[PDB]
């Protein structure tokens with residue numbers, strides 16, 4: 001028996017026991033995440049810990065099989081993924097050290113309460129009190145205090161922690177065949193085999209950077225517009241040819257300029273399409289929302305939800321009978337038990353959200369044919385990108401009129417279109433540079449290119465040169481503002497949002513081009529395009545069996561990211577911004 005045949009037997013065993021154990025874990029997690037109950041909490045911990053142990057032991061055993069001697073790229077990929085043990089190689093001592101550091105950083109983050117000068121008790125935790133301030137306040141001093149306090153009482157505390165976390169994680173990375181924790185994270189995009197469908201980890205840097213080059217002009221003009229309107233709101237502090245203060249971006253970090261819409265609304269009279277009132281009138285219940293979503297997916301040719309979906313999902317808050325976590329989640333428990341958890345209300349947002357989450361469900365149903373280790377999206381962004389393209393189609397007033405939530409005679413005034421596209425811009429085009437800069441700083445820091453003495457300095461240097469944002473109060477290396485973000489303090493990648501964003505518009509433009517739609521890409525409802533849903537399935541079923549490049553080619557027609565779809569989607573807004581910015585400054589001073 002060739003070592004590969006023995007390998008097949010190994011994996012065929014792994015997936016057979018794993019599929020099961022993961023289903024047991026997932027059912028326990030449905031129990032806890034729904035029927036919050038200490039008992040159920042304890043059972044969740046038990047089952048998840050058994051999953052952890054199984055994966056770890058099977059990973060060691062997989063290492064005892066040599067990847068270099070595996071033929072079928074499919075088998076090789078499953079093995080490779082299972083062979084990536086990670087924390088195992090480090091001594092159990094060092095393991096507990098890093099576990100304690102991650103736990104302590106997350107506990108500092110969660111236990112984050114800053115107090116207000118003049119108030120010895122206005123001290124409030126982050127999620128309850130601080131954010132509203134950073135999103136619905138027009139007081140420079142209040143927002144300033146919040147921003148400074150977090151990056152002061154929390155970032156400083158995390159500073160030594162993250163300092164040692166970098167060294168430990170780097171040792172873990174190089175413990176595996178890796179140059180830095182950066183290369184380890186970049187490997188999630190690394191795939192090999194097939195014809196030229198291979199993507200080396202270091203190519204990710206090249207591609208992210210060139211895509212950001214093409215997106216830079218749009219971000220520049222968006223910067224101008226937001227800057228000028230904010231100037232009129234905060235005149236004493238904003239400079240016309242300068243970067244923007246961080247505390248005025250709409251959230252503690254300024255990851256999404258969405259909350260700046262009231263202060264930066266194009267026009268401002270033409271109301272915003274809110275079918276919410278219409279839903280409230282047609283008595284649309286949560287089930288009706290999800291049923292219309294089902295009808296959409298059937299229209300493009302995709303299947304409809306299992307009986308199990310309608311019978312086992314929690315589509316509504318559990319009245320008052322139980323206590324639940326509301327954050328919307330899509331669930332593939334394994335073994336065909338697909339579900340969705342949401343505290344669905346009667347709101348356009350929850351409607352579009354149901355379409356997104358059900359798109360996740362459809363992806364899950366489409367790759368059930370694949371084995372366990374290949375039952376996932378091709379990269380880390382395929383999934384949420386599919387989800388988002390659903391909401392894009394379900395937001396076009398065309399589809400809103402079809403479902404009967406907007407009168408037929410209703411017409412789109414160019415003004416309302418610009419308003420909508422600008423809101424999309426802040427939330428999308430705003431996080432794009434923020435994301436690039438965050439992950440670049442982390443990548444270089446893990447690569448060591450940024451020494452600790454110039455750790456924070458570079459950070460704000462980039463925040464200005466890239467993001468176009470400036471520090472309100474100068475911060476020394478005593479601070480650690482990067483750790484101030486949950487995705488950074490809790491050891492999570494961040495480039496996923498950038499990649500997802502670039503992907504979703506590529507997908508939407510390809511599929512729309514299939515539906516033979518003509519006109520702006522912000523007006524596309526792939527509804528009834530059997531061919532569109534067919535291409536989508538022809539990718540979705542592939543899972544991660546085939547290279548992510550292959551999935552892309554099967555859908556969009558290219559093997560690598562392309563920003564041209566994103567630009568085409570926002571091009572109207574781009575031109576309007578250019579004209580609105582002619583007699584003003586488009587750019588920002590680096591040192592300011």
Ligand SMILES: *[C@@H]1O[C@H](CO)[C@@H](O[C@@H]2O[C@H](CO)[C@@H](O[C@@H]3O[C@H](CO)[C@@H](O)[C@H](O)[C@@H]3O)[C@H](O)[C@H]2NC(C)=O)[C@H](O)[C@H]1NC(C)=O
Pocket residue numbers: 298303304307
């Ligand atoms: C989903 O869309 C299909 C498209 O034809 C609708 O046709 C239904 O197809 C199903 C499956 O082939 C047929 O079997 C049914 O399955 C459900 C799910 O377990 C079960 O509850 C039914 O008693 C039946 O066994 C079904 O006869 C057929 N119905 C038609 C043609 O009216 C289907 O209606 C959609 N899904 C569901 C659950 O109805």
Ligand SMILES: *[C@@H]1O[C@H](CO)[C@@H](O[C@@H]2O[C@H](CO)[C@@H](O[C@@H]3O[C@H](CO)[C@@H](O)[C@H](O)[C@@H]3O)[C@H](O)[C@H]2NC(C)=O)[C@H](O)[C@H]1NC(C)=O
Pocket residue numbers: 299398399402525527528
């Ligand atoms: C995508 O395709 C669907 C078809 O499933 C389109 O919805 C359909 O729209 C037509 C025209 O309004 C509806 O016609 C209706 O026929 C019934 C037959 O009894 C009649 O009583 C009504 O007065 C009306 O004329 C049709 O029922 C409806 N399909 C449904 C409700 O399942 C939809 O407009 C298409 N969307 C896009 C973006 O192309």
Ligand SMILES: *[C@@H]1O[C@H](CO)[C@@H](O)[C@H](O)[C@H]1NC(C)=O
Pocket residue numbers: 035036037038039040322
């Ligand atoms: C919720 O948990 C409690 C405590 O473990 C248990 O007695 C009860 O049967 C559970 N109910 C549901 C609906 O999960």
